[PDB]
Design a protein around this ligand. Sequence first.
Ligand SMILES: Cc1c2[nH]c(c1CCC(=O)O)Cc1[nH]c(c(CCC(=O)O)c1C)Cc1[nH]c(c(CCC(=O)O)c1C)Cc1[nH]c(c(CCC(=O)O)c1C)C2
Ligand SMILES: Cc1c2[nH]c(c1CCC(=O)O)Cc1[nH]c(c(CCC(=O)O)c1C)Cc1[nH]c(c(CCC(=O)O)c1C)Cc1[nH]c(c(CCC(=O)O)c1C)C2
Lengths: 357, 357
Amino acid sequence: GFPELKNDTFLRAAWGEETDYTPVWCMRQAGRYLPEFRETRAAQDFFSTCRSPEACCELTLQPLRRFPLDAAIIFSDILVVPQALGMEVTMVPGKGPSFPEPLREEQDLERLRDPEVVASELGYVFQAITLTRQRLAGRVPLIGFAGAPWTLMTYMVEGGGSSTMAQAKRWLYQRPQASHQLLRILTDALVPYLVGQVVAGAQALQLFESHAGHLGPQLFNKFALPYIRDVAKQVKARLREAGLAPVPMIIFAKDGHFALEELAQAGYEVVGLDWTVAPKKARECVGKTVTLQGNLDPCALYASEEEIGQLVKQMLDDFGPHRYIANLGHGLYPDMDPEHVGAFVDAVHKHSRLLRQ
Amino acid sequence: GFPELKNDTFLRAAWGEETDYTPVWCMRQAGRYLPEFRETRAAQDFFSTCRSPEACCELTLQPLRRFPLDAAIIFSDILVVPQALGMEVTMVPGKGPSFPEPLREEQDLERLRDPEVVASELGYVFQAITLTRQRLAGRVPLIGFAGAPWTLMTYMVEGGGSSTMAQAKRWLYQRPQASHQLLRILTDALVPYLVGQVVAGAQALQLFESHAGHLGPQLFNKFALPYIRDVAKQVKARLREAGLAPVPMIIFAKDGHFALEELAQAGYEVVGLDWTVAPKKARECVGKTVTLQGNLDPCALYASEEEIGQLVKQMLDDFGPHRYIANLGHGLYPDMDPEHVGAFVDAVHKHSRLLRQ
Ligand SMILES: Cc1c2[nH]c(c1CCC(=O)O)Cc1[nH]c(c(CCC(=O)O)c1C)Cc1[nH]c(c(CCC(=O)O)c1C)Cc1[nH]c(c(CCC(=O)O)c1C)C2
Ligand SMILES: Cc1c2[nH]c(c1CCC(=O)O)Cc1[nH]c(c(CCC(=O)O)c1C)Cc1[nH]c(c(CCC(=O)O)c1C)Cc1[nH]c(c(CCC(=O)O)c1C)C2
């Protein structure tokens, strides 16, 4: 196996244990805001980068050379799963991901792979994880991840990003049967993939329901939540059955304010929050038995270093010291200053210690 | 290729030929004792400096603008090799180099790169060498370098400097198999790196066995010397096979008094000496068929310029005019006066000429 973990603060917090300080990581900590990321990425197309264990390992490590983050997240993408299901996907400059042949009718499901063979198609991800776990040498825990079923469905049907998800929601209302079929295919692909990430060396798992906020409560409960629940249940079961230690699982439903109570009951150790939910309100919705992660407005990092410190102070005061992992409320943007990211990390560490003594 | 070499005194001496005067260079001639070095270094972290061909070229050239040294040594560091093997390394203010995750058990070797890919990771070094060779414009020869296997092993296991090397020596005594494995990985990384330095423009190579003195004869013969021999043999072989002219190779084993006889038989043109060995004794140990380099106590440069001249006279008298390159017995210290370094250089040149006519 692997080097002994030296800083386990993130894991202890995820499981709800007291720690000496609040651990912090940043969504998209490996990203274009780092000049060195841009340089490493310049050599290959995006999905080819994802296919290279050494390139993924390098990108994962880059933020940790700059900042004393309490976790690493593997460099990959949520869209590797629809790709592995047999959909062609491109990264378009300045526009983002595109599926040139999205799913538009129920007959389109015929082209997908059997979900049970998807993990075998994602071996490159597992290779990256194993390599990164070795190279991290126990410094901090490594997080694996995937997209939640609904969020992946939206990319597969919309063919990319969308402001309304009108085509994907039209499936939910006009094609409910075919939608449940597709959501089950995705769940069945995700479970062995997530399990494989842990087998390969992942020490925690985060499921990104990035497109939660388009649904609202009734649709979310019918078409998103049952699959979010199934992923966590099945992953923990398969890990037990394999003789392995289950890992803490995080559910992040961006713009999912309306689902917080349900998500705290969905079998995830940690519930991630966007910046629109006030920390004290979130604590009320989720209760005392899950850990919260988040939730600073990423745009706050445009403020001066001093201002970032005061915003971080306020955030930490509102969350309190227990059952909390600090992060942004969404990923870092490409135009952010790495020094200001550094200021965020330093302020969490400094103030969370003051809030304990 | 490159400009014709104008002053080849250093090379002629290294190969054991008569020269009109004794050539001189100073270990760490690019260093903090120069105000202009401090200024150039202020802009980046140490390893980032090493990654910049222009910064390395500038640092290499700086001492040559002050002093008529008979060789330049490329600005780099021995620890680029363990870094290129996949270990993370930092420079800590006032403390020096640190590996936050040193090798402590045999399983830790799993995280290292295959040694055959290391040279590709060190392309930046070769870029610096090529640039510096061009910019030197034939003034004097350019020396490339690396750390010897044992010395690199000590940094990788200790995680930095050490007064005893107790952890690294514990490997030798308790983990001899794993030690030989690691020493072979390092040798196999070093050879293509050294060859690449010559391909890139290096005109001589120096291998630094800085931590020799901790071993004593039995351990040195089992764990240091075989790899010192292998590096020289394999480097010269690969250069021949590539159609290239082999370069003079220097072995400097600090505090290696006990190994001098063996080092003179290890396939290096030049044996470097620390200041604790009396020049006449060294000549006795090594014989008449290698060149000696050294060996003035760097602290002697704290003495007045007149005193430096007399100490240099005595040193040159003891070494004699043949098969000798003047240098210090260790690197220049940060608090030394550049004018006194100038006095050393001038005295070697002046007195070595008097000792011939
Ligand atoms: C976890 C993760 C993701 N992407 C990347 C990582 C690796 C971790 C890290 O980079 O630190 C690399 C990762 N992936 C991508 C990038 C940008 C790369 C580049 O510009 O070179 C990076 C750093 C490409 C990408 N990939 C994706 C998009 C968004 C498309 C849209 O506008 O709707 C984009 C732009 C799909 C994607 N990918 C991801 C999400 C979840 C968003 C959330 O809820 O926080 C989504 C929706 C998650
Ligand atoms: C050949 C060389 C070295 N370092 C440097 C050079 C470039 C040549 C030149 O600077 O003139 C730059 C070079 N490298 C460094 C510096 C200091 C830079 C600074 O303070 O800004 C310089 C000038 C950083 C460094 N790098 C290292 C240390 C020592 C750690 C310890 O205490 O054990 C240090 C302090 C590792 C190192 N590096 C080196 C050795 C061999 C020592 C010997 O036997 O003579 C070693 C052991 C060799």
